[PDB]
Ligand binder design. Structure first.
Ligand SMILES: Nc1ncnc2c1ncn2[C@@H]1O[C@H](COP(=O)(O)CP(=O)(O)OP(=O)(O)O)[C@@H](O)[C@H]1O
Ligand SMILES: Nc1nc2c(c(=O)[nH]1)N=C(CO)CN2
Ligand SMILES: [Cl-]
Ligand SMILES: [Mg+2]
Ligand SMILES: [Mg+2]
Length: 158
């Protein structure tokens, strides 16, 4: 199955973090990277006392179960120093979010797929569209169409 993973970093030299994350994603067992997006510099959504993000997306072919893939993305986050604080949508050395897991719909305590907010976020949809322009969401909507309709600002390269 192809999993689409959003990558964000706004602490501790985001370019180095995203390069490290890509290497580590490629080291996840029973998986392989298919496609990587460009790197974009995006203003923070949420609290404004934080740096701009590097945002990217990757397509990862995997035979892992979705929660097992999450275990591995979370491990990578911790290998790159991720800390979490009370404030919602605070900064991160590395944030790996599962946007889509094939065409699945997943509703569990640990995992909600499609990612709950991705359709509202150019910093997620634009990198996804670069690597999967023909993508169709589980609800039947086309990514390309959503982007044209919502008319989110185009992103700047990192
Ligand atoms: N699609 C998904 N991808 C990654 N985590 C998901 C997820 N759906 C639910 N999670 C859960 O989200 C929990 C908190 O992860 P965080 O990384 O702190 C949220 P965040 O990425 O900072 O905000 P965001 O989800 O609004 O982008 C994880 O412990 C995980 O169980
Ligand atoms: N620009 C940008 N803003 C964000 C991002 C992100 O990836 N990019 N992630 C958040 C929570 O994970 C909160 N805010
Ligand atoms: Cl959907
Ligand atoms: Mg996250
Ligand atoms: Mg996130």
């Amino acid at each position: 199955t192809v999993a689409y993973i959003a990558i964000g970093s706004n602490l501790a030299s985001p370019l180095e973090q995203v390069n490290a994350a890509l290497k580590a994603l490629g080291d996840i067992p029973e998986s392989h990277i298919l496609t990587v997006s460009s790197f974009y510099r995006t203003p923070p959504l949420g609290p404004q006392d934080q740096p701009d993000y590097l945002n990217a997306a990757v397509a990862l072919e995997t035979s892992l179960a979705p929660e097992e893939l999450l275990n591995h993305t979370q491990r990578i986050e911790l290998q790159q120093g991720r800390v979490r604080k009370a404030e919602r949508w605070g900064p991160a050395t590395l944030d790996l979010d599962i946007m889509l897991f094939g065409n699945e719909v997943i509703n569990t305590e640990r995992l909600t797929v499609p990612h709950y907010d991705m359709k509202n976020r150019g910093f997620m949809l634009w990198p996804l569209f670069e690597i999967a322009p023909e993508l169709v969401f589980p609800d039947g909507e086309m990514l390309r169409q959503i982007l044209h309709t919502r008319a989110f600002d185009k992103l700047n390269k990192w």
